[PDB]
Design a protein around this ligand. Structure first.
Ligand SMILES: O=C(CCc1cccc(NS(=O)(=O)O)c1)NCc1cccc(NS(=O)(=O)O)c1
Ligand SMILES: [Cl-]
Ligand SMILES: [Cl-]
Ligand SMILES: [Cl-]
Ligand SMILES: [Cl-]
Ligand SMILES: [Mg+2]
Length: 297
């Protein structure tokens, strides 16, 4: 049971060894397509590839490759698309994938610049009046509005398929203060944000899978999806004790490599799940408290 386990791990100081066990148990499947010569410039990181079996295929034509994985959580009945931050030559692909997969929401857990380097292209317009056209994929993207909070921004985007002129609203949930290889500032600030995504309807099974990305699409993104799926599983069962967190992370790792990149990101996942369980089990008021504690204003 997760809170008993948390305490024994903390008491014994053994997060490093627990996280290592995950690494040695994790699935290893091939990534032959990601490693083809023609795709080298579609990958941000040499050592971070989608498995072939779970990769998202673009419905082009010339080259169907994007560095993106469908994490299909069968028992939880929720799917997510995890991807790297788009590169200067893959921003059209990224929006093509959102359109073809019918996603309603994009969760971004990194900043464009982190520690002096460019970890993600500027793939969305910053000003209403300066829309983006992806000529390769025939898509147009316009900023509709934004709601800037102290550590995250929500944007309403309109994505238009220029071939059909159909338009869709995409909500962009941008967490701007989660350091790379780090953890959010508190369970509260993390959960206040996750529940904003949830409240938007972006995670509805009536939409395609939510797109989640950081820079590589594995550390911060795996921590976010792990916490959400564990909360979903105890919610479906109304039974916090039924959730095995490390088993859940190993199931997710069948779909994309490297999910959760440090032992402290694992520890933080336990914290966010233990805390979020209070809301799932019917203490509605904790949501207001997370909002206060997060200092979003
Ligand atoms: O090469 C890296 C860093 C990848 C990377 C590079 C840059 C940023 C981020 N962070 S993210 O944006 O939070 O994902 C992550 N890590 C080693 C690595 C890669 C792919 C898989 C594993 N497997 S693991 O079992 O050791 O976790 C380990
Ligand atoms: Cl940014
Ligand atoms: Cl910087
Ligand atoms: Cl970039
Ligand atoms: Cl950072
Ligand atoms: Mg203006």
């Amino acid at each position: 049971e997760m809170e008993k386990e948390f305490e024994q791990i903390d008491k014994s100081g053994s997060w490093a060894a627990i996280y290592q066990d995950i690494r040695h148990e994790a699935s290893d499947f091939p990534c032959r397509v990601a490693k083809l010569p023609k795709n080298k410039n579609r990958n941000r990181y040499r050592d971070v590839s989608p498995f072939d079996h779970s990769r998202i295929k673009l419905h082009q034509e010339d080259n169907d490759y994007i560095n993106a994985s469908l994490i299909k959580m069968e028992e939880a009945q929720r799917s997510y698309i995890l991807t790297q931050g788009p590169l200067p030559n893959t921003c059209g692909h990224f929006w093509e994938m959102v359109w073809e997969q019918k996603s309603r929401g994009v969760v971004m857990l990194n900043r464009v610049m982190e520690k002096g380097s460019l970890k993600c292209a500027q793939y969305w317009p910053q000003k209403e009046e300066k829309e983006m056209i992806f000529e390769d994929t025939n898509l147009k993207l316009t900023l509709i509005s934004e709601d800037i909070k102290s550590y995250y921004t929500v944007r309403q985007l309109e994505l238009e398929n220029l071939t059909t002129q159909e338009t869709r609203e995409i909500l962009h949930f941008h967490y701007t203060t989660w350091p790379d290889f780090g953890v959010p500032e508190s369970p509260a600030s993390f959960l206040n944000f996750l529940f904003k995504v949830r409240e938007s309807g972006s995670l509805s099974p009536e939409h395609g899978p939510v797109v989640v990305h950081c820079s590589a699409g594995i550390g911060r993104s795996g921590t976010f999806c792990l916490a959400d799926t564990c909360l979903l599983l105890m919610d479906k069962r109304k039974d916090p004790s039924s959730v095995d967190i490390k088993k859940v992370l190993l199931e997710m790792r069948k779909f994309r490599m490297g999910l959760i990149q440090t032992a402290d990101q694992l520890r933080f996942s336990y914290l966010a799940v233990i805390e979020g369980a209070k809301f799932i089990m019917g203490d509605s008021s904790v949501q207001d408290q997370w909002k206060e504690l997060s200092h979003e204003d």
